[PDB]
Amino acid sequence: TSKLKYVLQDARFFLIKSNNHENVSLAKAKGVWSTLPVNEKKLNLAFRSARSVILIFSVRESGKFQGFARLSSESHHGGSPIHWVLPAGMSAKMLGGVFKIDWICRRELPFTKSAHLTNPWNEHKPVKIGRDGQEIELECGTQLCLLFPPDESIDLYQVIHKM
């Protein structure tokens, strides 16, 4: 876990809520994510400001987090359309900005294991609670990531080089 801690050193953390499992599975396979423009702008700002920006994913109604990943780029808009399963009210143009991500952990964590972690940037509510795009304060974000089971399929050596 030493390289993982190095990656998380001085990182920023954002909670990502997905309305469906399909888009998270697509993101795990293709190494990309898209979000609404309001969160798009926040992530682009954070990417320039921090050694690592970490997205922590939770599919709505799953009672779990599905893993976490590190931004490797700002968003980009002209490309082969990612076949997101679009939520009601969410257009393809809204999700047009595509971030490239490197997965750090593709394993699940149930909300029952994070009940002791609260987020100061969301009124000290349990970290599972938050809107899509909610920033998670450093210490709580770091501890949440360290709770996930190790993903032995990942080699963080390549991630460290991009820092």
Residues that bind ligand 5ZK (CB under 6 A): 17-20, 23, 34-35, 84, 87, 95, 132
Whole-angstrom distance, CA of residue 27 vs CA of residue 53: 16
The answer to whether 19 is annotated as binding is: yes
Smallest gap from Cβ 13 to ligand 5ZK, in A, equals: 16
Considering the complex, what minimum distance in angstroms separates the CB of residue 42 from ligand 5ZK?
13
Question: Closer to ligand 5ZK at the Cβ: 84 or 148?
Answer: 84
Is 103 labelled a binding residue? Answer: no
Nearer to ligand 5ZK, 10 or 22 (CB): 22
Residue nearest to ligand 5ZK (CB): 19
Q: Are 52 and 72 in contact (CB under 8 A)?
A: no
Binding residues: 17-19, 33-34, 84, 132
